[PDB]
Design a protein around this ligand. Structure first.
Ligand code: HEM
Ligand code: HEM
Ligand SMILES: Cc1cc(N)nc(C[C@@H]2CNC[C@@H]2OCCN[C@@H]2C[C@H]2c2cccc(Cl)c2)c1
Ligand SMILES: Cc1cc(N)nc(C[C@@H]2CNC[C@@H]2OCCN[C@@H]2C[C@H]2c2cccc(Cl)c2)c1
Ligand SMILES: C[C@H](O)[C@H](O)[C@H]1CNc2nc(N)[nH]c(=O)c2N1
Ligand SMILES: C[C@H](O)[C@H](O)[C@H]1CNc2nc(N)[nH]c(=O)c2N1
Ligand SMILES: [Zn+2]
Lengths: 402, 404
């Protein structure tokens, strides 16, 4: 019933009892594990709502109190009459923090309790979405001293289309498909880049052109808004000892801000609820810059370092990947922008596992996403068994709206 | 596509569907409520059905399915189990089965080599002394003076009410771990327990960081007996670095032959409790796990100090730079000594080819993502971007609880 969870570096054992509170099935069966896949009525809404109100009142130590009983009554009265209901701002706040807490793929969960929640449920136009988005960015960025934040737009409603941000992140770089099928800029964004142009954006021709936002209010065509350049904090990349590196013209933006995920609380769904923390450096250094279907710079750097490229066993890839990561950390530290390296992040994550063992008897965790993409077994999370499962409130992936 | 898992490669965009998982006859540890994919360790009725299935497998593989010889073999297996409670494999069935157990092993990145396995049949073995002889022969053949050859030696199967053949060591070649005065370990902390066992059965211990352990070999219903391997049989590689001249001065070394000895090989419900097998190393196992794991030789900090790195802060990436150079030293040194080794890039490229071969041959390939992705430079290798489906096929290698 309750799985045994062993750390292989230390010999210690815990039992995860939290996984019994999971009420949604994941992709695995006893026949086959699918853990490595990235994407494998009123009475039901009513029990999800009840369960969530139960979680909220218990979080403020007021289970069973008058306020608790009466709030369950309001929920039932609203659902019975209308087929839906609405959260109080205090509940939205709690539910957002909890969705972060519950997110198995996030290594930054030590911070879960410290989240600025902007309530944007009074948004009625793409124009007003844009203003709220600009304020989020400004607040979150904070001149380099990054602060976690989420802005929550109006929930899904049975009668109509969703509020949606077409971009997968608030800040991403354009990818321009070229005459010969090569790409200038970020290959991951060729499509969204092509949508912006078709909606009348004038494109740059750089490797690092910040995309405009395509914002959609219900049942409307999306609308194009250019972010004012001074709101978008960026970090030029240079290397502590390798002088030519700065001349690569490389850079990355300060604010990692995910804008394509659906936030589910109490059975209510928030299709537009962008959120942001700060980067762990290996995502820029290793994945964005070195993935072969991304900026793919490993080979260029290796040659700059005069390494022997002809053979895999000179470990030229590993060597360049390391320097690129070092350059990311150095450059962020120099521009005084918050960032965490994979060693510090994974150590904080182990502390989080321990806090959650005590607080709730387990912590859902996706080993393949937690373990960084370089130096896996050099971090303590490599040696740590993890149980993965879905708790609610939750963040969920949603496919591109086009 | 159909009702079978969709499997995507995020680097290339390509898609396949795993249909082989349909053939899985054994439950793993995951359920719809929770994934346990990351845990290391999670009778006449039964035997005959497992045997029938394996015999069907063997006959498919020789293209004689439904034939007279197929039906006759099935009838011979039922009759054997009918009067003895067990049955015995033909020589060629054993060879097929041992290859298929390797092919089926989800944690092995070396499976491109699966069809090329020397299978030594040692089902006649009747003493610990004879196991020692067979093992020495395996080591000589497999090592082949540095030009390593995949091989497995299969000792007699488990029998009704008679003790097992067991190799107590987890590998044929491992270094001792000596528990010290101050609670620190000299040698390999992984082997502290087996070392104390060898001392208790009469071994005179050394006191180095790299003393080869003797073998503790158990024949049916006997205490294990101790056998020291002649040192000329155990090929080792002293470690040096191509540009950092002081690295050789560290006196680090590793052995050439990775030879696992505590796994159970299961074939058609028959259980081979002693069946040690060997390949060649993927370098990151020595360079990263054996030498840098905090709970193993743990040398990262010493090497970073020699490299003059800032070990007082995580953001210098001193761990990452040191691990890269140790991995490089391992590759260079093996290449110098002319001992077969494969780097994590070449291994993972070759496993991607294997996945494509098996997609065509069998419609999928059971694979354990957490084990296949290497412990340094994960996303620099193609396997990081490849979804994998994990399930248990038989014939299989199963982990065995230590006999002590
Ligand atoms: C405060 C600093 C934070 C750090 C250092 C951090 C770290 C990370 C990392 C490295 C990932 C994997 C990224 C990838 O490979 O795509 C991730 C995933 C994720 N994080 Fe965080 N995180 C932070 C804050 C937040 C916040 C504020 C939230 C939500 C309120 C959040 C929710 C999530 C979710 C839902 C995922 C999975 C995203 C997906 O499926 O694409 N994290 N985190
Ligand atoms: C031919 C060269 C080979 C290479 C490069 C190779 C590579 C590897 C590696 C790197 C591992 C993970 C080891 C660990 O982290 O503990 C492994 C596991 C494994 N391989 Fe291979 N392998 C080879 C040959 C073999 C052979 C000949 C067999 C059996 C016939 C085999 C069966 C296995 C099994 C059963 C495991 C899992 C062991 C465990 O769970 O502890 N492999 N392989
Ligand atoms: C198909 C698909 C499914 C899912 N679940 N995620 C994705 C997004 C895929 C999954 N890894 C790459 C791509 O995301 C890049 C964005 N990463 C977040 C910026 C980093 C981040 C870092 C620190 C804090 C925060 Cl809040 C966020 C795609
Ligand atoms: C509790 C436990 C369970 C399992 N399944 N395996 C182990 C052994 C644990 C799991 N990873 C570390 C430890 O093995 C180190 C030795 N690995 C074999 C040398 C490598 C190898 C390499 C190439 C070819 C071959 Cl035939 C074999 C322990
Ligand atoms: C196929 C595999 O699951 C996929 O490449 C995952 C692996 N681990 C990851 N880990 C993080 N943090 N982010 C990712 O995008 C991925 N990709
Ligand atoms: C907890 C985790 O499953 C464990 O440390 C695994 C991860 N991946 C591994 N992969 C390989 N090849 N060998 C191992 O020993 C491990 N250890
Ligand atoms: Zn699973």
């Amino acid at each position: 019933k309750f799985p045994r969870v062993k750390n292989w570096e230390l010999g210690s054992i815990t039992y995860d009892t939290l996984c019994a509170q999971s009420q949604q099935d994941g992709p695995c069966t006893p026949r086959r594990c699918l853990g490595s896949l990235v994407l494998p009525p009123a009475e039901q809404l009513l029990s999800q709502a009840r369960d969530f109100i139960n979680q909220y009142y218990s979080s403020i130590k007021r289970s069973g109190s008058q306020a608790h009983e009466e709030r369950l009554q309001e929920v039932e009265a609203e659902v019975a009459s209308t087929g839906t209901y609405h959260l109080r701002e205090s509940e939205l706040v709690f539910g957002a923090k909890q969705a972060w807490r519950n997110a198995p793929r996030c290594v930054g969960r030590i911070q879960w309790g410290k989240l600025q929640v902007f309530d944007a449920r009074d948004c009625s136009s793409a124009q007003e979405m844009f203003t709220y988005i600009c304020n989020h960015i400004k607040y979150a960025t904070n001149r380099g001293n990054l602060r976690s934040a989420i802005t929550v737009f109006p929930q899904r409603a049975p009668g109509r289309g969703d509020f949606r941000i077409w971009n997968s992140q608030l800040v991403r770089y354009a990818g321009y498909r070229q005459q010969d099928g090569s790409v200038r800029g970020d290959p991951a964004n060729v499509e969204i880049t092509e949508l912006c142009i078709q909606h009348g954006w004038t494109p740059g021709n750089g490797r690092f052109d910040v995309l405009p936002l395509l914002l959609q209010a219900p049942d409307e065509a999306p609308e194009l808004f250019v972010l004012p350049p001074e709101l978008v904090l960026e970090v030029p990349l240079e290397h502590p000892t390798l002088e030519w590196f700065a001349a690569l013209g490389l850079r990355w933006y300060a604010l990692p801000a995910v804008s394509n995920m659906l936030l589910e609380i109490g059975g209510l769904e928030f299709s537009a609820a962008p959120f942001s923390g700060w980067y762990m450096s290996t995502e820029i250094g290793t994945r964005n810059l070195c993935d072969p279907h991304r900026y793919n710079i490993l080979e260029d750097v290796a040659v700059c370092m005069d390494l022997d490229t002809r053979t895999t066993s000179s470990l030229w890839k590993d060597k360049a990947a390391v320097e690129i990561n070092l350059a990311v950390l150095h450059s962020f530290q120099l521009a005084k922008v918050t960032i965490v390296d994979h060693h510090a992040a994974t150590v904080s994550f182990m502390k989080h596992l321990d806090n959650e063992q005590k607080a709730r008897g387990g912590c859902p965790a996706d080993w393949a996403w937690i373990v960084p993409p370089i130096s896996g077994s050099l971090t303590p999370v490599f040696h740590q068994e993890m149980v993965n499962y879905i708790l609610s409130p939750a963040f969920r992936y949603q496919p591109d709206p086009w």
